[PDB]
Design a protein around this ligand. Structure first.
Ligand SMILES: [Mg+2]
Ligand SMILES: [Mg+2]
Ligand SMILES: [Mg+2]
Ligand SMILES: [Mg+2]
Ligand SMILES: [Mg+2]
Ligand SMILES: [Mg+2]
Ligand SMILES: [Mg+2]
Ligand SMILES: [Mg+2]
Ligand SMILES: [Mg+2]
Ligand SMILES: [Mg+2]
Ligand SMILES: [Mg+2]
Ligand SMILES: [Mg+2]
Ligand SMILES: [Zn+2]
Ligand SMILES: [Zn+2]
Lengths: 179, 136, 50, 88, 116, 48
RNA sequence: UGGAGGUAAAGCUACUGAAUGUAUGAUGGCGCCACCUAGGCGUACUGAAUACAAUUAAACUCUGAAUGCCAUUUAUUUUA
RNA sequence: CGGUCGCCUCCUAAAAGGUAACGGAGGCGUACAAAGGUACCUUCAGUACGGUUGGAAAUCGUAUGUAGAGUGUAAUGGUGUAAGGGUGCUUGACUGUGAGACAUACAGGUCGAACAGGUGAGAAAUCAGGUCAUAGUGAUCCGGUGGUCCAGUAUGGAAUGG
RNA sequence: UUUGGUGCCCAUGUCGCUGUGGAAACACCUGGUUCCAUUUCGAACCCAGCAGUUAAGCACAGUGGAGCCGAAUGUAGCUGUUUCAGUGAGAAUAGGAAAGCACCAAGC
């Protein structure tokens, strides 16, 4: 991506000057965006899950691996050995493609993108974005599951301090309230 | 009546009271204490009698601690029953008091009432009691 | 006692040379293993025999 | 009057397996002789000592048996058969 | 969860434990360790806990990290072992999958008179 | 990994008001699909 | 002289249960309000968790003997 | 009269092994074509934080945590790079045996180096004669089934046996 | 002697905090077109190269905070004979402790 080279030059220079980092790679670097479209109807309406996967596929270009629970609960009808939920972890070029596509196409199409920040870092530098609806994502046809759901896009960074993660977010211009 | 809320085993082997003093040997919460001079099995009934005696002869501001606790149970076969057919059912709970264990301690009221209070507590117990004070 | 045992016989000399176990309720398909045969003195397919 | 008596419910016990050490330290031993019978590896195997289908330690060569304490806080036991090593 | 070097050490510990448990004929143990730049090789003896023979890219003075130089390293280590009169060896990797450079080194050693 | 039926192809996206033809890899139609609200067409990102 | 062990004892911040007091205190009971649902201020009191000090156990052990047992070395004795 | 009668695990059992009572607690008369064999890869439960449906607790990411997780099961012992989880290929859940030992009144039981034949995994070293280990089992007689280089009551068969 | 690799060991070897370092090497790192790979991700494994790098890891110095180890005296249990001679724990404590033993390759 041309903006990926732009990320390289711009993040390097600005971040380097902002904290007098003694090495260019001391600046934070983003690693992997996990996407987790999981649903419990596969205990009963297994068919739904299959369709879920395909839509997830259509958004990222990586086929989703379906995850299995590590316990069993009667109230949730859960039992061990079943697949309830798919997770995808994008890296390299494809991850930056998805990130840019999200911030520029998917996110500003959000019904009321008022944003949420400062109250999302986990204290170790991560960040989770809870999407409410899937239809807003451009890579989805109108025909879909009878139930509509959201997303749990999360982020990681090389640094462990949430403030430096916020600094990278501001350098990337991720559009949230005051952050 | 002090009684354990639950026990893993209903019928355990009895615990000997012969020997020296394992723990609860020195007054460490109050400063006067009722020491034993003869190991014996004393049940929760004697504790309640002794504790009620101390409380009645206590004042409005005295404070007390009960060290020993009836952890171990004991059984008793029903009357007119010939030997055999298993162990009897648990009947009463007893605390194991060895020679040298401090059973009751008192503080926060003048010495004479405390000496008298320990005397009435020890007359309710089978063991031969003795008064001790706390090291400075 | 329950009878979960089964017999495995060769498919060349039709001799029964092995005694094994099988769950008819769980595993529905007949065993088709390959074991040593004393007669043929080689490895050969052994199938379940009534 | 007998008054009758209740019934006991637990009077069952199993045969005692004669486990434990068989060959003591310093005793000469030939191959294939049992050195330690156990349920679960209470004594680890070392050099010239094998294992069975019952976690039984048996020798693999002639020599003198020898126990050595090892492992965290010296809580693990290990047995070995130090070969005759006569070597003229 | 870790870094590459720690995982290789863990796998190497697995291989060393297995070899010391089953190597009954007391063969010399040829541990090869591959790095990002170079790959070195040393023939230890777990009975004496010493090194009998050694070979390395530093010793052979090559810009290594290629499958080509792995053949040269294998030839050198096999020549040293033959001079040492040891031919029954066990070959283990430093904890890396047997492939590429590792496979080339092993085949070069095998083709130069080694028995493994 | 590769050998997929869903090819990640660099598709361009146009927008109203500001053209801003962003080229992004996706498994869609190979033409200039126009988006009605992009990043630059949002009161939050630019515009108080 | 070497070794195997987990008893006596002791310990329970080294586990599993039982269990005392003090201090901070989840929790409920109890109120008084507002609010019909999200709750709030004190609780005659119950008591999670943590810290300090003290306890109990055949089927508890972070520990832990002596005796006894096995084998070997030396000296002596008996042909069992 | 009631209860029990075989096998396995713990305590009583007094730190080798063994040790009884109508002493104290429990289980078994199996399960698995994978939960076996091999090669490779991999490592808890819980808790804290952050996140649509989703809630105290489904799934995700990071960190912490030295076993409270798993090891089909009743307990005991063992085992956290293991004996736990996943994948690929397979059927050694082989044939004929078996020096030497454990424990035993006998009958029976348990471990097993090593040899020959032909295989499976693996580059090879090596491993595989069922499973992390201990319960899951019943003598002799009688008759039935399959194979067979033995017998066939004068001889050839057959019957009937071995 | 120092760096790198490895075996033996299995905290007086740990966890953490503060600083310093790279010549060669160790490492991150640069890319997935080749061999090879993801229950999906060149993250990992595997390739072919050293542009950048001392944040890491790694290696040195300090740090007694957590964890670990723990003397002597005394005591409880034991063996005998005594109602005293040995044997001697556990707990607690002063305190130690920022690993140690060998082999190999390079400048030394
Ligand atoms: Mg037994
Ligand atoms: Mg005791
Ligand atoms: Mg306790
Ligand atoms: Mg009867
Ligand atoms: Mg004994
Ligand atoms: Mg015993
Ligand atoms: Mg169990
Ligand atoms: Mg398998
Ligand atoms: Mg298994
Ligand atoms: Mg008959
Ligand atoms: Mg005839
Ligand atoms: Mg540094
Ligand atoms: Zn045949
Ligand atoms: Zn626009």
């Amino acid at each position: 991506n041309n903006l990926k080279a732009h990320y390289q030059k711009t993040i390097a220079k600005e971040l380097q000057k902002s904290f007098a980092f003694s090495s260019i790679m001391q600046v934070p670097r983003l690693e992997k965006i996990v996407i987790n479209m999981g649903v419990g109807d596969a205990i009963r309406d297994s068919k739904f899950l299959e369709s879920a996967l395909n839509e997830l596929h259509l958004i990222s270009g990586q086929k989703p691996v379906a995850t299995k629970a590590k316990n069993a609960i009667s109230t949730y009808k859960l039992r061990a050995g079943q697949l309830i939920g798919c997770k995808v972890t994008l890296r390299g070029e494809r991850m930056w493609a998805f990130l840019e596509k999200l911030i520029y196409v998917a996110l500003p199409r959000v019904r009321d993108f008022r944003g949420l920040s400062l109250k999302s870092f986990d204290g170790r530098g991560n960040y989770t974005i809870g999407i409410k609806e899937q239809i807003i994502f451009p890579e989805i046809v109108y025909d879909d599951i009878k139930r509509i759901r959201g997303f749990d896009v999360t982020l990681v960074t090389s640094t462990n301090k949430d403030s430096e993660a916020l600094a990278l977010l501001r350098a990337l211009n991720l559009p949230l309230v005051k952050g | 009546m002090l009684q354990p809320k639950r026990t893993k085993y209903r019928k355990p082997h009895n615990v000997s009271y012969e020997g020296k003093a394992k723990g609860n040997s020195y007054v460490a919460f109050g400063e006067y204490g009722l020491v034993a001079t003869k190991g014996n099995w004393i049940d929760a009934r004697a504790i309640e009698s002794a504790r009620i005696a101390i409380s009645k002869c206590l004042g409005k501001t005295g404070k007390m601690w009960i060290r020993i606790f009836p952890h171990m149970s004991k059984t008793k076969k029903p009357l007119e029953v010939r030997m055999g057919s298993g162990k009897g059912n648990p009947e009463f709970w007893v605390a194991v008091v060895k020679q040298g264990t401090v059973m009751f301690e008192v503080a926060n009221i003048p010495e004479s009432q405390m000496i008298k209070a320990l005397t009435r507590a020890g007359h309710k117990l089978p063991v031969t009691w003795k008064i001790l004070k706390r090291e400075e | 006692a329950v009878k979960r045992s089964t017999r495995l016989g060769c498919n060349d000399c039709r001799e029964i040379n092995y005694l094994t176990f099988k769950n008819v309720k769980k595993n529905p398909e007949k065993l088709a293993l390959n074991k040593f045969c004393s007669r043929c003195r080689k490895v050969v397919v052994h199938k379940e025999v009534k | 009057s007998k008054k009758g008596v209740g019934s006991t419910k637990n009077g069952r016990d199993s045969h005692a397996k004669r486990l434990g050490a068989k060959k003591a330290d310093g005793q000469m031993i030939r191959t294939g002789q049992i050195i330690y019978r156990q349920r679960g590896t209470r004594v680890y195997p070392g050099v010239n000592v094998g294992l069975g289908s019952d976690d039984t330690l048996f020798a693999l060569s002639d020599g003198l048996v020898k126990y050595q304490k090892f492992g965290p806080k010296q809580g693990k036991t290990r047995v070995s058969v130090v070969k005759h090593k006569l070597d003229a | 969860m870790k870094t590459r070097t720690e995982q290789r050490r863990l796998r190497h510990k697995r291989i060393v434990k297995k070899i010391r448990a089953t190597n009954h004929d007391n063969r010399v143990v040829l541990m090869v360790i591959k790095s990002l730049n170079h790959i070195s090789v040393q023939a230890w003896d777990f009975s004496q806990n010493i090194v009998l023979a050694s070979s390395s890219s530093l010793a052979l003075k090559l810009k290594n990290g290629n499958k080509d130089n792995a053949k040269l390293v294998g030839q050198d280590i096999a020549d040293k072992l033959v001079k040492l009169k040891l031919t029954n060896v066990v070959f283990d990797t430093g904890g890396s999958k047997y492939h590429g450079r590792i496979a080339a080194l092993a085949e070069a050693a095998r083709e130069r008179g080694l028995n493994f | 990994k590769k050998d997929f039926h869903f090819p990640s192809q660099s598709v361009s996206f146009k927008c109203a008001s500001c053209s801003n033809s962003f080229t992004i890899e996706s498994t869609l139609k190979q033409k200039e699909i126009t988006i009605d609200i992009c990043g630059k067409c949002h009161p939050f990102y630019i515009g108080e």
